[PDB]
RNA sequence: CAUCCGGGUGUUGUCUCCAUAGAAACAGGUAAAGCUGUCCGUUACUGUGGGCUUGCCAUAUUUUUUGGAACUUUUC
């Protein structure tokens, strides 16, 4: 469907993420999934309090994976 | 490959005894030898005991509960 | 061989039903969906306080239905 | 069934969430997981606001659906 | 299929034995909000229909304050029942 | 969804990994499966006292794993 | 460079045969037309009949729809 294949369409670009933990992070995929599964790389971690860090590879799980973000040109993709 | 299968059937063979965590109850343990199992993660634990340190003592349970199986 | 069949006879009707959350919503019904997706018109929607919404839309404990309806009826296939 | 979904396509809806939040934007995409992605997305946690763009929220954090506006034209 | 042979050997068979008696069945649920009520049928999920409800629970503002409601029919779906007593009145 | 992930380069390597409870061990990632079970060896884990053990993990409370060398 | 024998597409007109009531009625104008306004034929909510553009075609036991929820308390 179109909510599936329109993040395959993103990869490459940076996209942002929400998850049932509550923490936010931030980077340049490389690899999406069927599941919603992620692959970024140069994330940019942010919690609810506010602390920022960096990790540098990260796998994500569909089911944690809330709400995400995609490019905006990516909006004249067709479906 | 070491499948999470495969490692699972060296466990009831060896009879080696196996902690068991909580799904989102840290504070509780698990322990004992499983003799046989299940495809969904069921546990047939023998020798059932509940791990400050206050041990309490055939125990059977849910694989949707179970956090990490760790031998020794 | 579901009760899901009979409640998309129960369109039309109102109701208030509780979710999940636990929000309270009265409106009649306009179609039930074979996962429970229900459509709801001239609604009055509670949480805060009662706010009315036209046309709203897993998390529903139960409707609570009008006991003007014959239940037998229904209950057939 | 899927009828009452693709009716409300190219329209401005107000989703409430599973966590509270309430994102506004029109809708682009419906999928059989009640996965929706959304153009145009403002949140309301609350007397506050949030910009974001294009999102894709799924289905088990979504609660329900409620149009605000009518379709553009 | 095979839901046919369980349904009346199965614990869900006493959901018909209670039921086809018109038995009441106290279910206590999700909420923290037991149900009293009459059932009239129910499925695999346990998706049951009452006739007469009556729940009973405790609140605070703080003491204890049990408090009553009738409701006449309710299709509570089943994913928050977490037990239903099938109490016999004999 | 059947087609486990490629952890296979990092596989015999070092591991940070994210678990959950805010919990934390360091071991060599030995096999992997089709719901992102690992198997650990030499672990480690990270209170500030670290015990060695020499595991098994689960994979659904695993959030992620990282790389101590890069 | 010409001539000659032939050709295509479009438009309006005309002729032939068949059909007919129909509102093919009225008025503006161009190089062309319902080009434009009024206008009417079935007629926009139903029941019987045809066809599909259709519902995706049916998963309570790990990544979405059979619940890891419930409940308590403080700080502003």
Redesign the pocket.
């Known amino acids: 469907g179109i909510?599936?294949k329109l993040l395959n369409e993103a990869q490459g670009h940076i996209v942002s993420l929400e998850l049932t933990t509550g923490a936010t992070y931030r980077g340049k995929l490389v690899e999406s999934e069927?599941?919603?599964?992620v692959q970024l790389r140069d994330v940019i971690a942010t919690e609810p309090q506010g602390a920022v860090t960096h990790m540098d590879q990260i796998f994500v799980?569909?089911?944690?994976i809330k709400f995400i973000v995609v490019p905006d040109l990516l909006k004249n993709a067709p479906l | 490959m070491v499948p999470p299968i495969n490692c699972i059937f060296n466990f009831l063979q060896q009879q080696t005894p196996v902690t068991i965590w909580?799904?989102?109850?840290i504070g509780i343990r698990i322990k004992g030898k499983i003799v046989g199992f299940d495809?969904?993660?069921n546990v047939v634990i023998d020798e059932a005991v509940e791990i400050k340190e206050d041990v309490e003592k055939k125990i059977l349970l849910k694989?949707?509960?179970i956090t990490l199986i760790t031998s020794a | 061989?579901?009760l899901?069949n009979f409640l998309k006879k129960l369109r039309n009707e109102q109701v208030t039903i509780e979710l999940?959350?636990?929000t309270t919503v009265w409106g009649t019904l306009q179609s039930v969906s074979?996962?429970?997706?229900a459509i709801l018109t001239d609604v009055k929607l509670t949480l805060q306080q009662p706010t009315a919404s036209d046309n709203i839309a897993?998390?529903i404990?139960q409707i609570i239905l009008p006991d003007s309806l014959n239940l037998d009826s229904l209950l057939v296939d | 069934?899927?009828?009452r979904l693709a009716n409300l396509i190219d329209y401005k809806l107000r989703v409430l969430t599973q966590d509270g939040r309430v994102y506004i934007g029109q809708l682009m995409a419906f999928?059989?997981?009640?996965?929706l992605v959304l153009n145009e997305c403002i949140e309301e946690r609350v007397v506050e606001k949030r910009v974001l763009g294009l999102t894709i929220l799924?289905?088990?954090?979504i609660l329900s659906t409620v149009v605000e506006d009518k379709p553009l034209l | 299929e095979l839901?046919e042979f369980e349904f009346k050997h199965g614990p869900m068979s006493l959901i018909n034995d209670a039921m086809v008696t018109r038995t009441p069945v106290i279910i206590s649920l999700?909420?923290?909000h037991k149900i009293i009520a009459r059932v009239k049928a129910f499925?695999?999920?346990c998706?049951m229909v009452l006739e007469n409800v009556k729940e009973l629970w405790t609140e605070?503002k703080?003491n204890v304050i049990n408090r009553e409601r009738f409701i006449s029919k309710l299709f509570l779906?089943?994913?928050?029942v977490i037990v239903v007593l099938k109490t016999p009145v004999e | 969804?059947v087609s486990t992930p490629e952890l296979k380069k990092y596989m015999d390597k070092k591991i940070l990994l994210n678990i959950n409870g805010s919990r934390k061990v360091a071991g060599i990632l030995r096999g992997y499966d089709?719901?992102?079970n690992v198997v650990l060896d030499d672990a480690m884990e990270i209170n500030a006292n670290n015990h060695q053990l020499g595991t098994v993990i689960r994979?659904?409370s695993i959030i992620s794993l990282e790389a101590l060398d890069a």
Do not use: A, C, Y
């Open positions: 909510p599936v069927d599941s919603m599964n799980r569909g089911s944690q | 909580l799904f989102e109850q495809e969904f993660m694989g949707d509960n | 061989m579901k899901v999940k959350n636990g074979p996962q429970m997706n897993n998390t404990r | 069934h899927s009828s999928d059989k997981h009640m996965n799924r289905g088990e954090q | 839901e999700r909420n923290n499925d695999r999920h998706n605070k703080k779906r089943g994913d928050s | 969804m089709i719901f992102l994979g659904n």
